[PDB]
Design a protein around this motif. Structure first.
Motif, mmCIF file in Angstrom:
data_model
loop_
_atom_site.group_PDB
_atom_site.id
_atom_site.type_symbol
_atom_site.label_atom_id
_atom_site.label_comp_id
_atom_site.label_asym_id
_atom_site.label_seq_id
_atom_site.Cartn_x
_atom_site.Cartn_y
_atom_site.Cartn_z
ATOM 1 N N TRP A 1 2.308 14.365 6.007
ATOM 2 C CA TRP A 1 2.089 13.303 6.975
ATOM 3 C C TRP A 1 1.323 13.762 8.202
ATOM 4 O O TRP A 1 0.997 12.929 9.052
ATOM 5 C CB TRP A 1 3.429 12.701 7.390
ATOM 6 C CG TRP A 1 3.323 11.329 7.920
ATOM 7 C CD1 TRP A 1 3.877 10.861 9.063
ATOM 8 C CD2 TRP A 1 2.612 10.235 7.340
ATOM 9 N NE1 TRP A 1 3.566 9.541 9.234
ATOM 10 C CE2 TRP A 1 2.786 9.133 8.187
ATOM 11 C CE3 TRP A 1 1.850 10.078 6.185
ATOM 12 C CZ2 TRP A 1 2.224 7.895 7.920
ATOM 13 C CZ3 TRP A 1 1.291 8.853 5.924
ATOM 14 C CH2 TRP A 1 1.484 7.776 6.784
ATOM 15 N N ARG A 2 1.028 15.046 8.322
ATOM 16 C CA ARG A 2 0.217 15.525 9.423
ATOM 17 C C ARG A 2 -1.253 15.205 9.171
ATOM 18 O O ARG A 2 -1.659 14.858 8.063
ATOM 19 C CB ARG A 2 0.410 17.023 9.598
ATOM 20 C CG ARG A 2 1.813 17.466 9.308
ATOM 21 C CD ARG A 2 2.099 18.787 9.946
ATOM 22 N NE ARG A 2 3.441 19.249 9.631
ATOM 23 C CZ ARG A 2 3.705 20.341 8.925
ATOM 24 N NH1 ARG A 2 2.714 21.087 8.465
ATOM 25 N NH2 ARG A 2 4.960 20.688 8.684
ATOM 26 N N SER A 3 -2.057 15.327 10.217
ATOM 27 C CA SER A 3 -3.492 15.158 10.093
ATOM 28 C C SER A 3 -4.164 16.529 10.031
ATOM 29 O O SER A 3 -3.503 17.567 9.937
ATOM 30 C CB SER A 3 -4.025 14.314 11.242
ATOM 31 O OG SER A 3 -5.398 14.052 11.063
ATOM 32 N N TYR B 1 0.841 -1.184 0.000
ATOM 33 C CA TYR B 1 0.000 0.000 0.000
ATOM 34 C C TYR B 1 0.878 1.235 0.000
ATOM 35 O O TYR B 1 1.776 1.361 0.836
ATOM 36 C CB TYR B 1 -0.934 0.028 1.208
ATOM 37 C CG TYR B 1 -1.703 1.316 1.298
ATOM 38 C CD1 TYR B 1 -2.856 1.504 0.558
ATOM 39 C CD2 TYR B 1 -1.267 2.352 2.103
ATOM 40 C CE1 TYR B 1 -3.556 2.680 0.627
ATOM 41 C CE2 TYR B 1 -1.958 3.532 2.174
ATOM 42 C CZ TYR B 1 -3.103 3.690 1.439
ATOM 43 O OH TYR B 1 -3.795 4.872 1.509
ATOM 44 N N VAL C 1 -7.971 14.242 0.176
ATOM 45 C CA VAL C 1 -8.556 13.201 1.003
ATOM 46 C C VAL C 1 -10.049 13.162 0.748
ATOM 47 O O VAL C 1 -10.680 14.209 0.573
ATOM 48 C CB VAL C 1 -8.246 13.486 2.481
ATOM 49 C CG1 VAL C 1 -8.919 12.515 3.357
ATOM 50 C CG2 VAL C 1 -6.761 13.437 2.714
ATOM 51 N N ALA D 1 0.473 5.369 0.311
ATOM 52 C CA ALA D 1 -0.450 6.437 0.689
ATOM 53 C C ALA D 1 -0.347 7.574 -0.324
ATOM 54 O O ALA D 1 0.071 8.693 -0.025
ATOM 55 C CB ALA D 1 -0.155 6.920 2.099
ATOM 56 N N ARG E 1 -10.044 18.582 4.744
ATOM 57 C CA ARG E 1 -9.924 17.208 4.293
ATOM 58 C C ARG E 1 -9.895 17.129 2.777
ATOM 59 O O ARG E 1 -9.100 16.383 2.203
ATOM 60 C CB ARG E 1 -11.082 16.391 4.850
ATOM 61 C CG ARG E 1 -10.751 14.958 5.037
ATOM 62 C CD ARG E 1 -11.498 14.371 6.183
ATOM 63 N NE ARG E 1 -10.850 13.142 6.605
ATOM 64 C CZ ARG E 1 -10.945 11.998 5.946
ATOM 65 N NH1 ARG E 1 -11.672 11.928 4.847
ATOM 66 N NH2 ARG E 1 -10.322 10.923 6.388
ATOM 67 N N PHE F 1 -2.758 4.128 7.815
ATOM 68 C CA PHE F 1 -2.301 4.421 6.471
ATOM 69 C C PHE F 1 -2.763 5.812 6.079
ATOM 70 O O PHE F 1 -3.911 6.186 6.322
ATOM 71 C CB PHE F 1 -2.858 3.400 5.491
ATOM 72 C CG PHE F 1 -2.749 1.990 5.956
ATOM 73 C CD1 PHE F 1 -1.566 1.508 6.468
ATOM 74 C CD2 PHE F 1 -3.824 1.138 5.861
ATOM 75 C CE1 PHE F 1 -1.463 0.212 6.879
ATOM 76 C CE2 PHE F 1 -3.725 -0.162 6.277
ATOM 77 C CZ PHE F 1 -2.545 -0.624 6.787
ATOM 78 N N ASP F 2 -1.861 6.589 5.483
ATOM 79 C CA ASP F 2 -2.218 7.905 4.964
ATOM 80 C C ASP F 2 -2.780 8.787 6.080
ATOM 81 O O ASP F 2 -3.969 9.091 6.137
ATOM 82 C CB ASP F 2 -3.215 7.768 3.813
ATOM 83 C CG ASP F 2 -3.032 8.822 2.760
ATOM 84 O OD1 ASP F 2 -2.173 9.712 2.933
ATOM 85 O OD2 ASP F 2 -3.753 8.751 1.750
ATOM 86 N N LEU F 3 -1.879 9.156 6.989
ATOM 87 C CA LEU F 3 -2.278 9.828 8.223
ATOM 88 C C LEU F 3 -3.196 11.009 7.954
ATOM 89 O O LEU F 3 -4.122 11.271 8.727
ATOM 90 C CB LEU F 3 -1.034 10.283 8.976
ATOM 91 C CG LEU F 3 -1.145 10.585 10.461
ATOM 92 C CD1 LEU F 3 0.178 10.343 11.109
ATOM 93 C CD2 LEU F 3 -1.540 12.007 10.669
ATOM 94 N N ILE F 4 -2.954 11.740 6.866
ATOM 95 C CA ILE F 4 -3.828 12.855 6.528
ATOM 96 C C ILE F 4 -5.189 12.372 6.064
ATOM 97 O O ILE F 4 -6.174 13.105 6.179
ATOM 98 C CB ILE F 4 -3.176 13.745 5.460
ATOM 99 C CG1 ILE F 4 -3.756 15.147 5.518
ATOM 100 C CG2 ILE F 4 -3.390 13.170 4.083
ATOM 101 C CD1 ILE F 4 -2.840 16.187 4.942
ATOM 102 N N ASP F 5 -5.272 11.146 5.559
ATOM 103 C CA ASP F 5 -6.518 10.586 5.058
ATOM 104 C C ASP F 5 -7.245 9.800 6.131
ATOM 105 O O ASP F 5 -8.476 9.778 6.157
ATOM 106 C CB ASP F 5 -6.238 9.657 3.880
ATOM 107 C CG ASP F 5 -7.503 9.151 3.219
ATOM 108 O OD1 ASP F 5 -8.168 9.899 2.489
ATOM 109 O OD2 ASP F 5 -7.890 8.008 3.493
ATOM 110 N N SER F 6 -6.495 9.139 7.011
ATOM 111 C CA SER F 6 -7.099 8.218 7.962
ATOM 112 C C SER F 6 -7.857 8.955 9.053
ATOM 113 O O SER F 6 -9.051 8.722 9.250
ATOM 114 C CB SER F 6 -6.024 7.322 8.564
ATOM 115 O OG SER F 6 -5.750 6.228 7.715
#
Lengths: 260, 52, 51, 52, 104, 52, 52, 52
Positions: E19-21, C17, E52, C19, E47, F38-43
């Motif tokens: 990699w941030r949220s 996978y 996303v 990302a 988002r 997975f995909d921290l911005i997406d998860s």
């Protein structure tokens, strides 16, 4: 990972994603100089202009908006320009009317495929409080189990869809007439040698983040620019575009100062 | 993501930057969510025989 | 037996996978994408009744 | 004749200001409920209107 | 602030802003603003602006976990604001004062 | 809170921990979990500032 | 409830608490909701022969 | 019996100053949104009513 188990394929795919995204962003804003930022594309901000003054005081497709007030677009801001008023309903009606008084299609049922592009913080945070002000009764059956707190919404305006994207400049509402906003590409495929060095596969675009990339008619030259050097592939993925706005007072119509 | 940049349809073929891929790596931790109970065998048979 | 499985020799099977979620919505491109015109000439000429 | 039923085919003319920003709030303040299904998808923000 | 200045799975959030949220707080952070519909949209666009999936119908199976002091005490009166009328007919026999609700 | 448990496919170890101690049985119930994203911005996306 | 503690992969095996089960005990009271009455046996036949 | 469905056939007799000047404005308050459509061709201003 299969992404690293085929870096060239993923390099191509990432280049295609960023190529589509770059074309979108420049079609929104590209002053028209043939450099790495603007690519010579004239986009929308160079077609219509940015400010109300920029709608005049310029030139597009050679025709000077200065000597030719009809070649200008309908860029109109707020009470005082460049200060982000609140996008009242009177404001959109006023722009559609200034679009009407220009003899330009101002409704979605007038057979010219209009559209509206907003910074997508407008479609969700300015047109959502709006349409709560043009209606008094957003009906919901209280016993609704599937009580969607913020439902799927399309937000037409006089039948003009208000599709939005977040690469559009903020505080703006581009009312486009897609029937006079072609994309033009120079097809030099027939002027390329018969060697299988150039493949010309089409650019892909998604309208949502959940749909198939939907190959377009816009072709992108995927040409290996490999040398005699045996150890390198050295691929290139290039495309050239102009965003023509036929009938500039019909193609682009911008609302300039939205509060958010 | 890879930067695009551009040439001039006859300009040089300089190459641009590529999109990076980092290896994300978590691990099923070396820790547990345990619950253990000392059940006396005395209070298994007693509780069995006298359990209301 | 920490030493006898050194990290240099423990290649764990990663999950296949990537990302790769980046902004790809291009509805501005999306609309006016199937109506791209591929000319064989560089210039785009048309008339404009200015007055 | 003062209605549309009277067989003489009236009409009203406005500047497209009054039609679109004096009759729209007016109708908003004449009917007491503009019924929109809140979950309606294609909710035109300024639907086509004839304002008879 | 903790969205950046961190690491996860070996990828540093500092050196890799992708990699941030999408954590977002109030006008002044750590003060528990009122959860207007606007900030839920602001998150759901932030988002979107990050490539996303943001709408539920985007082939992706989203979900929203909540304190249940928000689903019942904050979304319920927030829904009464996002809509204009809750349109139950008066002569309904079985009028539930607090009906089953999913708050999509 | 009112439906059948519907066992997950997450396996929690019921280790029959014990000693030579015959009178004492001493089970243990432990599981180790990672919540990879997975995909921290997406998860995960958080709206941390809620009011209640 | 039996609190869960947790341990490393190979750490200790200390216990953690259990949940109390109390024997709740009620009783049908030694009391009644009673209601008793004394009819004159004369009244039973008299009213049976006289009640309107 | 207090409800009307209790198989006992209740009724209320008012002076017509109640059924029209009292129960009508009252019903205007027990329920909001009496909700007749504004483009109704025959807007009966005191419609035939029963007022149970």
């Amino acid at each position: 990972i299969s992404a690293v188990r085929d870096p060239v394929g993923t390099a191509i795919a990432d280049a295609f994603d960023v190529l589509s995204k770059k074309i979108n962003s420049v079609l929104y804003t590209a002053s028209g100089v043939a450099d790495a930022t603007n690519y010579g594309i004239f986009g929308l901000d160079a077609a219509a202009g940015t400010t109300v003054a920029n709608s005049a005081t310029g030139t597009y497709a050679g025709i000077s908006k200065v000597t030719f007030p009809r070649w200008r677009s309908i860029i109109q801001g707020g009470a005082v320009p460049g200060t982000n008023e609140a996008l009242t309903i009177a404001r959109m009606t006023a722009m559609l009317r200034a679009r009407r008084t220009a003899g330009v299609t101002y409704k979605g049922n007038q057979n010219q495929r209009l559209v509206i592009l907003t910074s997508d913080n407008i479609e969700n945070d300015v047109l959502r409080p709006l349409y709560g002000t043009v209606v008094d009764n957003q009906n919901v059956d209280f016993t609704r189990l599937d009580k969607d707190l913020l439902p799927y919404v399309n937000y037409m305006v006089k039948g003009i869809p208000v599709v939005s994207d977040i690469d559009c400049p903020a505080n703006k509402m581009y009312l486009l007439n897609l029937d006079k906003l072609a994309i033009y590409s120079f097809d030099q495929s027939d002027a390329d040698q018969s060697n299988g060095k150039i493949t010309y596969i089409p650019l892909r675009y998604v309208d949502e983040t959940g749909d198939t990339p939907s190959e377009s008619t816009l072709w992108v030259r995927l040409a290996d620019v490999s040398d005699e050097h045996p150890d390198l592939l050295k691929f290139e993925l290039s495309v050239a575009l102009q965003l023509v706005a036929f009938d500039l007072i019909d193609s682009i119509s911008v609302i300039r100062d939205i509060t958010q | 993501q890879g930067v695009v940049g551009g040439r001039t349809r006859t300009g040089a073929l300089a190459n641009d930057t590529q999109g990076t891929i980092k290896g994300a790596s978590l691990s099923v931790p070396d820790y547990y969510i345990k619950h253990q109970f000392d059940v006396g065998k005395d209070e298994i048979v007693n509780s069995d025989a006298t359990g209301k | 037996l920490t030493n006898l499985t050194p990290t240099e020799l423990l290649a764990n099977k990663a999950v296949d996978y990537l990302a790769n979620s980046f902004l790809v919505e291009t509805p501005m491109l999306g609309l006016l994408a199937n109506r791209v015109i591929n000319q064989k000439q560089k210039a785009i000429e048309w008339g404009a009744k200015v007055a």
